[PDB]
Amino acid sequence: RARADKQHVLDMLFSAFEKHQYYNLKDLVDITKQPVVYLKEILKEIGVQNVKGIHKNTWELKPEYRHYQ
Length: 69
What we know:
The chain is built from 3 helices and 2 strands; from the N terminus they run H-H-H-E-E. By secondary structure, it is mainly alpha-helical.
């Protein structure tokens, strides 16, 4: 199924996160035209969220239990 995309999609996040510690959903879709709901479900399990002054949506790969790096 699309788990191939999941595993393969995480690789894209590391490349993205390799350039900057933060990325909003809008920046992630440019790097991957895959449905946000699909990316969000991946970011929801290992990602994080942070609203700021103007409510800047930023996601971060939670390294707390990432056995894969």
